[PDB]
Write a protein that binds this ligand. Structure first.
Ligand code: NAD
Ligand code: NAD
Ligand code: NAD
Ligand code: NAD
Ligand code: NAD
Ligand code: NAD
Lengths: 551, 551, 551
């Protein structure tokens, strides 16, 4: 309306950016200090206030406070210094906040559906004020980064993720809905806490759990549409793979942990090859770890191979996996699951009892660290790759840094700068002795999920096939310039995650349309112009009314 | 209404306290974490959080964020630890916040009137969303405590002041209005700060300034009534006195800086007399300082004296003042003003050039430190007094602690535990070589204004005479129990400022009616029941609609 | 929200129908009489009330007052007695209301755009409180039926028109937008009336007029979309045709006055052919009149013919027209326009000076009365036709009844019950000397536009081709059951216009998809289920919030 409510609403509050005319006309005069500020000035104010801040957590609390008060300024701010603000609002720090959730808590943020609510999920869904919701991010808080099961504190994740859907892709904030399904928590620490904000019960694993997810899926589509994008996040391996399969062809869904991961990784391996043009038949990849990330990446790698001329079987034979019980080999005592068998091959004559051994026995051309257990890519493992291959492809994806398999410096120096390196955690440029400076790239999931979400939404796509991620991967790598690829950059600078994201969305829409997966039909001729035109801008909208005379 | 709006309104918002029933029936189910908490658990969480807090400003930012999200909880917390929180929300920490204003600024909190809006102050005033305003606190921010002129940053004062009107007296927050008039600022640190939130101009001191205060005075009573309590604060000596003189008989107004000061001070003295019972005529009071506070406490002392059998001229002659220029003598080169004149006596035979000399030449039985210039109550002046009087009354009121004229330990030790001591800033017990524990009291204004504002509001009083303050002083001193005086306390424990404030309310109302100053006329027989029956409680209200069958 | 606002909103207001539960839980308990009624009792009360009503205008004022207080009830009532109410709400009574407008005026009901607001039409358009508008009906009020130019009083037309879009087709009322453009009025009775509610100026006919229609056309699609259904009505021949030509391929628009007329008419003829099966080439149609309606039905006949094996030139030659100036002959002094030209044939040897002569000289097998000038189908012309044709097709379409060319009794009696008859205005059975009951049908547009608007809306069609109307005509005629034709009905009973309208919807959608005219592409397999699944129901919705325990 007019007056105060205009200020108590973040979707409208312009704060001191309300002009004099607006303050006067809207009944705000006197309610704000005597100075009128522009959006530029407000961003400049926050930047300074955040600049002189210590912890990433306090930076988080402060910036998220800006979102609950002024959504336009908040995105302007976060878009003005996205490279550094992204890890605060999301990526690494959000996980710190999910730990303090309840202690740092100040104001709710999304939609909470508890197992106690079973049978009434649509009523809870109908309580969501937004009518035109296009992008939903769900989590049950069961697996938050390396923090484990945080219960309802996991809500901090979808919130931060959606923050990026908007900041990078330009997806409308009002059409985004963060959701957290509370079925209980297995984290005893939380259960004991009297300030815990969730169901005081152990994670319900009964059928009720499955039915509740079904209900929630149905309820969301019933009100918002069968094509409403629903992305699972931090669900817990078993549920994440099975729900992905169970719904992928029934709803517009996908799990970023499995597929976004798979695509960012593939994108790296693709930029590598653009360097060492060697027969795809000349590749053998070794995985340090055989879990969620490893499986998603293998599967998408295999798909890249097949589409190039190799059988499914052939593609999978060039992929080996080494988890905490050693090389995933046919018959081994340690058990192997469905998703793993395709990569569980016949034991070599020499069964390694060390990754370094495997690296020597199997002789892979590429190594991928997804074990999340420290520097397991020892100098012995490293130099044992630089010796085996002219240009070793080394991927240490385990986060946070302390968990990585190795640093960039380790990789580069130990390989005299002949390795193609990339990691999940950031590392600065490694300037060796000869003067060479190698700028390593970080394979962050944000390169993929935002542009893929927008493309699917703008094309009214109702089902997301894995082929869209291969397409996505390809689209990311195609962004890398010559010079970028010449300095060890297997990823475009995170500083332009925006145009990279649009470019990715544009390419993906072109793909959806050409493969009849799109349904917004008076089909655009210029898919670029199309996408570019539908991106939400953080610019403030003028509120004045059109007043004119009359002849 | 119901739904989100209910949560976005601090007056109604009860956070995790809304019951399941309320959430369901109100359209909130799903917008809040699946946990039901009590105001007790809530208070408990924020308390524990605040305990583990380092800096006070942080503490202030934290707690002021609760007040902007859940008013009830805020006052609940504030009242749960009144003594420790009052100084954060107001008393001393608030002044630190005013210097920060613009840096810490999260959301606006009061009504801003600028000399730019002259002629249109009513419009601004009509923008205030509350219709039944009973208590206004104004400031032009010209003299915030020791910080000086902080322009519009002075708003933090009326805001914190009012928090206490509510916290101690039970004055309904929705009937409180924090006001700040911006007529320019003389502070060059401000005029040059690009993120300053006020008018970039030197303080206007022309007729427009006076005209604007009148306009504001008329605009406020026009909308809310002529009996609307308007309290001035941190205005700057010349204006504070003259405006006090100019409207005290035209409106319902008072100046806590002048009048509330005179009452807590005077109430300390009255407390002392419970020990030193000698005739009032035998008193001689020497003031370290001759400013606003010296002239305030002095004039009120005179009245207590005059009302005790002394002519007004004699009363005046029992008081002496020593500013920076030395003893306020008749004829001194150092200029003397109209308000000091009555205390500028003829020069004694021995004119001191030092306060120690003065203490000697006049041998006052009472000394009041109000110069705000550090320890001017030298260990010698102290002892001088202990030798001139059996139980000397030493009042070191200058704040903050660093400006205090001396300390608890100082005074008590240098007097052997004979002196009766009081100070502006706090000091903990002073245990002596003989094991005698001496707990001094603090002369904080918060003792007077809360209970006095509520009495005036509830009686529909239209004017406040100094006699009302004399009565508050006597009402406060009557709160002192034998024991606390047996401990050195010249005031009741600040720990229970609530009841002390209510009891002062009941006292002053009784006096107002009895003196035909009250206008709420169906006059109560039990003034106690009357006051207590009208205090605002912090208890959450039930928001559940009445559902029942129809027989 | 809840409370009074819920009752002041016709969309939500359910009057005495709100349940006790809803009243209690919604804050209405006490604001409504202590009685709970059903929509059935409600409908029943207003029905009985309306039965005991004398004049139709009263009936209109009454019922239009229900629509402004309770939308659901309104459509419930309207649909409970569709045949008798349609003529009150629209068809004929509505025109009477337009003359009264300003006298009967209670509350505004649509969107008013004035030539005064040129350049600012978007602003006005943005003021419309509905965001998802699917159907707009525009009129400049230049030609309201027989009443002529009624300026802004023409608003009553789009309003009543739309009531039927909803009543018969099930098009959601909140997605309907009645529009009236005021560019001045030529009516002197209006220009002089001091209580006139429009612009006191003669109709603008300069470029500004054309410019304003464009502006309106662009402003409407700008906000709601390019596929937004915009229907023109009562515009005035020249404009209605030219604007129809100008935008039919630019926007999603049609003119019911031209196109809907041509379809009900033509659908009557098609019905007749179910009796007179002779080859289409053997048909000869003579028109009494050569205006908008004659040119509409003619052109659509041509298309049905052309699509049946006739060249377009021949089709045209099977039609003849007789305006006020006599037979439309080649060379006649009486001017002939571009639209009549194709039906202005070379003069026969015997040029009639009378329609009876014409009927003789051309011996048409079909005659259509569209001159709006009373009984021009003289008892002689009638018999002439009955002697020229075994079963002559006589269509007296001029309205109201007084302008009809002849009557049911007339035609049937003067033909011995051989003629196939249809009329614009209603006529009850015509029982004959032999006891043969002849129930004629009425060619009301309400047969076509409702079902056609819904088909176009649901298919996201962006343009409407005459072929769509040809299809509506064939879709309607297919509704006719043997029996009703056995009774003389050349159209289905207006009593069941609902299903007849839905069935026409399902038919036209099937045609739209099949001809690549639809754009809602996840194309339904069961178009019937698709249409029926999207009709708006008049049933009251439950407003009770979901309350339940937590196990
Ligand atoms: N974009 C990215 O950078 C990105 C994306 C997804 C996951 N990751 C990282 O991948 C790591 C693993 O994630 P996940 O979801 O696959 O986990 P997971 O728990 O599903 O699997 C971890 C695997 O590592 C193996 N492992 C653990 N300790 C080992 C050890 N000491 N020696 C050998 N193998 C060991 C386990 O057997 C297991 O198979 C995490 O650190 C995560 O940060 C990075
Ligand atoms: N052929 C055309 O180009 C055409 C046709 C009809 C209407 N329109 C215009 O489009 C508007 C209405 O169409 P629409 O809303 O379906 O848009 P759209 O068709 O351009 O977008 C397609 C889908 O993407 C979604 N979307 C767009 N931007 C989004 C964002 N930034 N964040 C999240 N989701 C987003 C929409 O909800 C929609 O479901 C109207 O204003 C109209 O002027 C264009
Ligand atoms: N309730 C309380 O405890 C309370 C209330 C009000 C004021 N105060 C304190 O009183 C002090 C002064 O307040 P004010 O508003 O009257 O100030 P003011 O500026 O109006 O007056 C200060 C006076 O002290 C004199 N002075 C300054 N330095 C001196 C020196 N070195 N030696 C002797 N005299 C000196 C000045 O001449 C001046 O007359 C402040 O520090 C304030 O904290 C305490
Ligand atoms: N004789 C009686 O005891 C009597 C007579 C009439 C009405 N009432 C009751 O009083 C209520 C309304 O009357 P009222 O509001 O004028 O009360 P009031 O007349 O008792 O209060 C006197 C004044 O003090 C103000 N006030 C009361 N509590 C306040 C608070 N906590 N904070 C700030 N200002 C406060 C009021 O606004 C009023 O101007 C009604 O609900 C009615 O039930 C009592
Ligand atoms: N669905 C229906 O039943 C329906 C639909 C549309 C129009 N109509 C009726 O058709 C009539 C005309 O509508 P229109 O919009 O085409 O009108 P119009 O003014 O555009 O055309 C009327 C034509 O009739 C001719 N005419 C007038 N008097 C004549 C006379 N005395 N003898 C011979 N010809 C004469 C005129 O020359 C003119 O060409 C109206 O009365 C209207 O009620 C019925
Ligand atoms: N494949 C499917 O069957 C499918 C796919 C996605 C969403 N949905 C459902 O559709 C709903 C929202 O989609 P939609 O509104 O675009 O529907 P829709 O796509 O089925 O309807 C097509 C068009 O017709 C309009 N429309 C429908 N009924 C109307 C009516 N009665 N009156 C006037 N206009 C009407 C709509 O506004 C839309 O522009 C959601 O609640 C969702 O559950 C169904």
């Amino acid at each position: 309306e007019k007056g105060k409510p205009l200020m108590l609403n973040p979707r409208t509050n312009k704060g001191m950016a309300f002009t004099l005319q607006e303050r006067q006309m809207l009944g705000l005069q006197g309610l704000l200090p005597p100075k009128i500020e522009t959006q530029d000035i407000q961003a400049l104010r926050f930047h300074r206030n955040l600049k002189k801040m210590t912890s990433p957590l306090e930076k988080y609390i402060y910036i998220m406070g800006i979102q609950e008060r002024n959504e336009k300024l908040f995105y302007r701010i976060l878009q003005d210094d996205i490279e550094s603000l992204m890890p605060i609002v999301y990526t690494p720090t959000v996980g710190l906040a999910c730990s303090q959730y309840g202690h740092i808590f100040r104001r709710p943020k999304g939609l909470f559906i508890s197992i106690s609510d079973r049978g009434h999920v649509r009523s809870i869904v109908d309580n969501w004020p937004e009518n035109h919701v296009k992008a939903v991010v769900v989590t049950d808080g069961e697996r938050i980064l390396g923090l484990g099961d945080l219960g309802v504190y996991g809500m901090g994740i979808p919130v931060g993720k959606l923050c990026l859907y908007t900041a990078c892709a330009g997806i409308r904030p009002d059409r985004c809905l963060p959701v957290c399904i509370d079925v209980g928590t297995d984290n005893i620490a939380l259960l004991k806490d009297p300030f815990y904000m969730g169901l005081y019960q152990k994670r319900d694993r009964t059928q009720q759990y499955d039915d509740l997810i079904d209900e929630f899926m149905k309820a969301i589509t019933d009100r918002y549409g069968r094509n409403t994008l629903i992305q699972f996040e931090d669900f817990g391996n078993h549920n994440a793979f099975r729900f992905l399969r169970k719904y992928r062809e029934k709803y517009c869904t996908f799990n970023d942990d499995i597929q976004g991961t798979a695509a960012v990784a593939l994108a790296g391996l693709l930029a590598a090859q653009k360097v060492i043009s060697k027969p795809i038949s000349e590749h053998k990849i070794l995985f340090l770890g055989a879990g969620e990330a490893a499986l998603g990446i293998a599967n998408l790698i295999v798909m890249s191979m097949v589409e190039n001329g190799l059988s499914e079987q052939e593609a999978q034979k060039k992929i080996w996996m080494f988890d905490k019980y050693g090389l995933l080999v046919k018959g081994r005592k340690a058990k192997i699951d469905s998703y793993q068998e395709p990569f569980t091959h016949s034991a070599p004559e020499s069964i390694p009892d060390t990754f370094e051994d495997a690296v020597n026995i199997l002789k892979p051309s590429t190594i991928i660290g997804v074990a999340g257990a420290g520097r397991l890519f020892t100098p012995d493992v490293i130099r044992a790759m630089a010796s085996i291959n002219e240009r070793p492809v080394i991927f240490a994806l385990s986060n946070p840094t302390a968990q990585a398999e190795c640093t960039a410096e380790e990789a580069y120096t130990l390989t005299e700068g002949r390795c193609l390196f990339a990691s999940g955690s950031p590392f600065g440029p490694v300037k060796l002795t000869d003067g060479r400076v190698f700028t390593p790239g970080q394979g962050n999931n944000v390169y993929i999920f935002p542009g893929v979400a927008l493309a699917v939404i703008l094309c009214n796509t109702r089902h997301i096939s894995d082929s869209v991620f291969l397409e996505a991967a390809k689209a990311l790598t195609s962004q890398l310039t010559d010079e970028e690829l010449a300095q060890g950059r297997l990823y475009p600078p995170l500083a332009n995650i925006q145009e990279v994201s649009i470019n990715i969305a544009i390419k993906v829409t072109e793909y959806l349309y050409a493969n009849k997966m799109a349904f917004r039909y008076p089909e655009p001729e210029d898919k670029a112009k199309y996408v570019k035109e539908r991106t939400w801008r953080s610019e403030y909208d003028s509120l004045l009314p059109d007043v004119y005379e009359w002849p």
